[PDB]
């Protein structure tokens, strides 16, 4: 529609997060975050020991 003037694409997903704490002096958080979809090709992202 001429009033809408474009589209916005909203992408929900489930993120696999590494369980880490915030670093006192950290520049950015080191929590690896990946799409669950990645696990279908590379499911090793889900394993932990």
């Amino acid at each position: 529609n001429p009033i809408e003037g474009g589209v916005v694409q909203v992408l929900p997903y489930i993120a696999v997060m590494k369980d880490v704490y915030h670093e006192v002096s950290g520049v950015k958080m080191d929590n690896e975050e990946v799409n669950m979809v990645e696990a279908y090709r590379d499911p090793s992202i889900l394993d932990d020991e």
Partner: protein
């Protein structure tokens, strides 16, 4: 025979041939391996992890084992698909013989 495929990153460029019973039963030793599965439980409790904050942690705790029965297997490492379907394989040779 039958063909079963995966896209696991680990199982990349591998063909393995294994026997199985034509008709599968229950806990049949003649299946190449067993997957022994115990029901997975979802645990929900507001654990105060860290001693200073409370979070509701919902955990899925698996309990299972994969067991192999039959030692028979054939393993084939199959590579070079792009070399035989890409590069010329017969007339290339005749050129190579050119003195």
């Amino acid at each position: 025979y039958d063909i079963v495929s995966t896209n696991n990153q680990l199982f990349d460029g591998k063909l393995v041939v294994i026997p199985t019973r034509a008709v599968q039963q229950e806990n049949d030793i003649l299946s190449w391996g067993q997957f022994f599965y115990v029901s997975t439980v979802i645990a929900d409790l507001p654990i105060t992890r860290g001693g200073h904050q409370v979070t509701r942690e919902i955990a899925a705790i698996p309990f299972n084992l994969h067991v192999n029965n039959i030692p028979f297997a054939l393993e084939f490492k199959i590579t070079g698909f792009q070399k035989v379907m890409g590069e010329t394989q017969f007339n290339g040779k005749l050129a190579d013989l050119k003195p």
